[PDB]
Write a protein that binds this ligand. Structure first.
Ligand SMILES: O=C(c1ccc(OCCN2CCCCC2)cc1)c1c(-c2ccc(O)cc2)sc2cc(O)ccc12
Ligand SMILES: O=C(c1ccc(OCCN2CCCCC2)cc1)c1c(-c2ccc(O)cc2)sc2cc(O)ccc12
Lengths: 225, 223
């Protein structure tokens, strides 16, 4: 785990990338609040399966005990679906690419009980990713970080060194791209601060989701794996 | 102006803006914390106005920044002042609570535990006051940041990163240790946001835009 070079880390992660799934094939439009919720729910659930496989490929992840793994996923799943959303939405200004066959815009997002707020936040995040020209290899570094860090609250120590290893890898990608040492640290901070907002959106979303078992589910899923 | 400060000028500006540590004036426990929070707010606005870049913002923007960061600000200060009081939260010098005392409020334990773990992690990394003050300003500037305006703030933020690294180098960490520590501290900003988000839920379960607007307004007519 802590034996991978910057480059080995990066390729490992890129390989672990989950596939991009599709929305239940053309149901009916315009959707309703429940119909859209249903497409979104079906999608998320199917994506949750791949997430488990990806998690299991995240350096450090499978060194933890099954129950700690469940804890990290329990807490990060929504952040992780969201960073994937934002990233695949980058080249669709004004719209979110929940799936290739389900590209919604601000107005569609209002069909559901106050997701406008989040949708907008989400919109702004890919926008900033676009603005910063976020790169694939950095994106995968940010996801792994979200996975290890949202739930981190000799094992504690282990995760902190994997986390330090991903920072190393993020700065290594920046240097190799020619950034100045000053630009390196600035970009590193611009990225980690975006995790603050990502977290923010998942807490808002979790609230919106519950206004409208996971442990056991993930345990079952993680153990089955 | 803000963008022209050196790393060391930034730090002292900041150290200078520190609010005073207030005391508990003593829904009893909830009373105590509401009174404390309320009086702290008043100084927060004041310190806000001394964060480089902050006053270059429109009044609306200033209120949006505090509207979203106030609780993260209160918490990071609680955390910091709790550091050397393992097992307890030092809400005030005359109001040091423990895990169990936090239990007397429904839902407070989980946040309380979270608050405890954050000060623990601050202890663990030997967070320095200079670094602390740096992290508070980033919180103010970042939690509500979501067009030469957007850009200003982002530059102020870059300068804070610069200052953060400066203190680290100055302290003698290696280049590698610098980005590592920088990253360790900024991931703690997600947990802080997390506690704030959870804390507002809890606050509103129990039972401000203009409040700050007036406050930010009144500050220009204050002696
Ligand atoms: O709409 C969803 C969403 C819907 C249902 C979900 O979960 C339903 C239940 N499921 C139970 C087993 C554990 C996995 C979750 C999760 C996300 C998505 C998001 C969301 C956005 C705004 C908002 O206000 C609330 C949520 S973002 C997102 C990205 C995706 O790839 C998929 C769904 C989503
Ligand atoms: O208890 C408080 C607190 C209590 C009442 C508050 O609100 C007072 C209402 N007021 C209205 C106008 C805006 C300013 C707040 C805010 C914080 C504090 C915290 C808290 C912790 C756990 C939790 O679940 C909820 C809150 S943390 C904290 C730090 C302080 O310096 C002061 C109070 C606090």
């Amino acid at each position: 785990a802590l034996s991978l070079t910057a480059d080995q880390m990066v390729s490992a992660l890129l390989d672990a990338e989950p596939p991009i799934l599709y929305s239940e094939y053309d149901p009916t439009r315009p959707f309703s609040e429940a119909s859209m919720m249903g497409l979104l729910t079906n999608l998320a659930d199917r994506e949750l399966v791949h997430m488990i496989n990806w998690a299991k490929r995240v350096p450090g992840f499978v060194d933890l005990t099954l129950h700690d793994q469940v804890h990290l996923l329990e807490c990060a799943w929504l952040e992780i679906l969201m960073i994937g959303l934002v990233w695949r939405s980058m080249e669709h200004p004004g719209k979110l690419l929940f799936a290739p066959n389900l590209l919604l815009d601000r107005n569609q997002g209002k069909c559901v009980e106050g997701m406008v707020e989040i949708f907008d936040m989400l919109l702004a995040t890919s926008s900033r990713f676009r603005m910063m020209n976020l790169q694939g290899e950095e994106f995968v570094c940010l996801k792994s970080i979200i996975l290890l860090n949202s739930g981190v609250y000799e094992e504690k120590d282990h995760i902190h060194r994997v986390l330090d290893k991903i920072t190393d890898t993020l700065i290594h990608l920046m240097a190799k791209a020619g950034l100045t040492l000053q630009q390196q640290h600035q970009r590193l901070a611009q990225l980690l601060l975006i995790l603050s907002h990502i977290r923010h959106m998942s807490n808002k979303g979790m609230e919106h989701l519950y206004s409208m078992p996971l442990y056991d589910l993930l345990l079952e899923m993680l153990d089955a794996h």
